[PDB]
Amino acid sequence: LLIGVATSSLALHAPSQIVAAIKSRADQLGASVVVSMVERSGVEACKTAVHNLLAQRVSGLIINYPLDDQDAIAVEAACTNVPALFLDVSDQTPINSIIFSHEDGTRLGVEHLVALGHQQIALLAGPLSSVSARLRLAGWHKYLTRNQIQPIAEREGDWSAMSGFQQTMQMLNEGIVPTAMLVANDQMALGAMRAITESGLRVGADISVVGYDDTEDSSCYIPPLTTIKQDFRLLGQTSVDRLLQLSQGQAVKGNQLLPVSLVKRKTTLAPN
Amino acid sequence: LLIGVATSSLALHAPSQIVAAIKSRADQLGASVVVSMVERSGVEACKTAVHNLLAQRVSGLIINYPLDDQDAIAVEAACTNVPALFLDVSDQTPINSIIFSHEDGTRLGVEHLVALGHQQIALLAGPLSSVSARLRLAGWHKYLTRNQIQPIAEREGDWSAMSGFQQTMQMLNEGIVPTAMLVANDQMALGAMRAITESGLRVGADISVVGYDDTEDSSCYIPPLTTIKQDFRLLGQTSVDRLLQLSQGQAVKGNQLLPVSLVKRKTTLAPN
């Protein structure tokens, strides 16, 4: 009845909303949620958070922190038995996990932009130290290749909007001007949109932009941001439910893939 | 060494950043942070979170949840001894607390708008069930009165940007058109700005807007939002440090007031 979540700093809208979603389901099932945080980067930082939550004697562990195939294995190893369900790893890692289909999330954005008749496309990835950011960047390239298009430029941010702003501006300053951009997340997407605007360019009419996540605020950006929806509410529920089941040895012991979807708003249009 | 935070759903950027700030200081002092969440509204929901954290045997409790003078007293009462430092109550409540000066935060926005030569002013408060939202709304009225100005309209949102969007639009639809607005928080401020824009009106040039908090994203809104800064980083640190001291019976047992400041950006200008 008492679950333990080891997450990344709530500084980011995504992890936050997820913990909120987890709390929400836990409430519905009459359970408690003890949240522990990771000092950011480092598998070590993660391993330790396990200890904190293990100490508290939680009857389950939900790990919402990025981990590489090897580190994930390790963290579980040190997660000495107690059910361990990861939420930010690769679908290939041999452990109990639940993640959104990066494969579809990326095909959707590439195809939306393509069908709209776009060809000059730029990519703004998340920090590549993040397995999430990676699966996402490689995904874009995969579908852009299938559609026979090479991005006219690609960059790396850090999930922040400021990074999205600096990257997009550096780009425009270099003279690289796409008709559309694919961004690793809505916050950065927000930053991108500001640089575009402050470049006398209209977001959408001149440079279409496609975010990722569909965090709360995104529907009120200017203009409203088109993005790939990642229903954390759903993730919250599912990750909760499966954990309770895992503890009762009556659950699937592999990897789950949650669906995703395109939310068309006011930032995507045909090229000029 | 193990502190316990009972907060409001991380769904909101403010509480999140605060927990992050708290974690940050705790790390610097080599301490642990067990975060518990309140099912939103209700002193009861709060009291229970105390139990969760008390169970875990934390050597300190930081309560970042809104509480009325009476409820705050109660929560502490049931906080059976263990140090209890509140972060979202009134400076008048007789308990250990740390909060930002709503008095200054509100005078700053009113004076900034006034000196800019504004007179047609509208107010967009936060949910009045929130002691924070309240101290803030009454604050605006106080300084607007001192400056001999009655707002041409005032409304209530819920901290969300969508609420900021709906309120600001309902207002404009009614025909009420201010030259400036004072919003209870940056997220809602963001919503307000969208309604204004979609009303063929320029944020700043036509309707100046002043947010509250200075959350991360605010510096990349369009245009960059002028707002009252509430250094959660500072709050995080201070609330942490004082707790560790309270546990060692060597700390101030009253209320502290953290300073605040105006961050001038691109959303405030003289009326037309």
Report which of A190, A191, A193 is spatially closest to residue A201, judged by C-alpha positions.
A193
Contacts of B34 (CB under 8 A, 6+ apart): A34, A35, A36, A52, A56, B2, B3, B4, B5, B53, B56, B58
Q: Which residues of B touch A56 (CB under 8 A)?
A: 34, 56
User: How far is the CA of A256 from the CAs of A21, A24, A92, in angstroms?
Assistant: 18, 20, 11
Is the torsion defined by CA of A150, A152, A157, A160 positive or negative? negative
CA atoms within 13 A on the CB side of A263: 18
Tell whether B39 lies on the interface with A, counting CB pairs under 8 A. Answer: yes
Which backbone phi and psi does A35 adopt, to 5 degrees?
Answer: -95, 125
Return the amino acid letter for A259.
Answer: P
Cα–Cα distance measured from residue A144 to residue A138, given in angstroms and rounded to the nearest whole number: 10
Crossing angle for the helix pair B43-55 and B69-78, to the nearest 10 degrees: 20
Asked if B33 is an interface residue toward chain A (Cβ–Cβ < 8 A), one would say: yes
- How would you classify the pairing of strands B32-38 and A261-263? unpaired
Q: How far is CA B198 from CA A264, B119, B158, B203, in A?
A: 18, 23, 21, 10
Residues of chain A with C-beta less than 8 angstroms from the C-beta of B219: 161-162
**Residue contact B20–A10, C-beta within 8 A:** yes
DSSP symbols for A222-264:
SSPPEEEE--HHHHHHHHHHHHHHHTTT-S--SEEEE--EEE-
Helix, strand, coil share (%) of chain A residues, nearest 5: 40, 20, 40
Q: Which of residues 91-130 of B touch A (CB under 8 A)?
A: none
Q: Tell me which residue has tokens 């270099």.
A: A174
Residue B260 · residue B229 · CB < 8 Å: yes
Please indicate whether, in this complex, the C-beta atoms of B52 and A37 are within 8 angstroms of each other.
no
CB atoms within 10 A of CB A165: 23
Residue type, A246: L
- For residues B33-55, one letter each, b for 16 or more C-beta atoms within 10 angstroms of the residue's C-beta and e for the rest, the string is bbbbbbbeeebebbbbbbebbbe
Task: Tell me how far apart the alpha carbons of residues B136 and B100 are, in angstroms, rounded to a whole number.
Answer: 11
Q: Are B7 and A4 in contact (CB under 8 A)?
A: no
How is the beta sheet containing A261-263 ordered, strand by strand? A153-156, A121-125, A180-183, A208-213, A226-229, A261-263
- Cβ–Cβ of B220/A9 closer than 8 Å? no
Residue B20's Cβ-side half-sphere holds a number of Cα atoms within 13 Å equal to 22
Please check whether residue A164 touches B, CB under 8 A: yes
Min Cα separation A147/chain B (Å): 33
Q: Report whether A153 contacts A180 (CB < 8 A).
A: no
Establish, for the pair of chains A and B, how many residue pairs have beta carbons separated by less than 8 Å: 104
**Pairing relationship of beta strands A84-86 and B2-8 according to DSSP bridges:** unpaired
Q: Which 165-184 residues of chain A touch chain B by CB within 8 A?
A: 165
Nearest CA distance, A5 vs chain B (angstrom): 10
Three-state SS for A13?
helix
Cα distances (angstroms) measured from residue B159 to each of A16, B101, B166, B189: 16, 19, 12, 9
**Distance between CA atoms of B218 and B216, rounded to whole angstroms?**
6
Interface test with A, best of B18, B28, B35, B166 (most A CBs within 10 A): B35
Residue B37 is inside which H or E element, if any? strand B32-38
- Farthest CA pair distance, chain B: 59
Distance to chain A for B20, nearest Cα, Å = 6
* Interface check A37 vs B, CB under 8 A: yes
Gyration radius (Cα) of chain A, Å: 19
Residue with structure tokens 């790893």?
Answer: A89
Tokens 């502490």 correspond to what residue? B76
The neighbour count for residue A54, using CB atoms within 10 Å, is 18
Residue A254: Cβ-neighbour burial (10 angstroms; 0-12, 13-18, 19+): exposed
Task: Indicate the residue type of B63.
Answer: I
Count Cβ atoms below 10 Å from residue A61 Cβ, excluding itself. 27
Query: Is A216 in Cβ contact with B161 (below 8 Å)?
Result: yes
Q: Determine the 3-state secondary structure of A19 from DSSP.
A: helix
A2-27 b/e with 16+ CB inside 10 Å = b? Answer: bbbbbbbbbbbbbbbbbbbbbbbbbb
Domains contained in chain B, CATH given: 1-100+230-259 (3.40.50.2300), 101-229+260-272 (3.40.50.2300)
Calculate helix-pair angle for A186-197, A161-173, nearest 10 degrees: 40
Q: From the list A10, A162, A191, which residue is nearest B10 (CB)?
A: A10
Query: What DSSP designation does A203 have?
Result: B
Tokens 């922190």 correspond to A65
Contacts of residue A55, defined as CB under 8 A and 6 or more positions apart, other chains included, come to none
Structure tokens at A124: 């703004």
Q: Which residues contact B250 (CB under 8 A, 6 or more apart)?
A: none
Dihedral of the alpha carbons of B142, B147, B151, B156, in degrees to the nearest 10: -30
Which residue in B217, B240, B265, B267 has the most chain A C-beta atoms within 10 A of its own C-beta, making it the best mutation to test that interface?
Answer: B217
| Tokens at B70, concatenated | 């009476």
Cα dihedral across residues B109, A225, B157, B70: positive or negative? negative
Query: Which residues of B fall within a CB distance of 8 Å from A190?
Result: 217, 220-221
How far is A33 from A18, CA to CA, in rounded Å?
12
The single-letter code of the amino acid at B221 is: Y
Are residues A164 and A191 in contact, defined by beta-carbon separation less than 8 angstroms? yes
**Resolution expressed in Å:** 3.0
How far is C-alpha B54 from the geometric centre of its chain's CA atoms?
26
Nearest-by-Cβ selection for A9 from B23, B191, B217: B23
Nearest to B183 by CA among B205, B162, B212: B212
β pairing state of B180-183 and B153-156: unpaired
Establish if A190 touches chain B: CB-CB under 8 angstroms: yes
Contact A190, A221 (CB under 8 A): yes
Q: Give the Å distances, CA to CA, from B69 to B90, B239, B258.
A: 7, 20, 19
Mutate to test the interface with B, among A35, A167, A199, A232 (most CBs of B within 10 A): A35
Strands (E) in chain A, as ranges, are: 2-8, 32-38, 61-64, 84-86, 97-100, 121-125, 153-156, 180-183, 208-213, 226-229, 255-258, 261-263
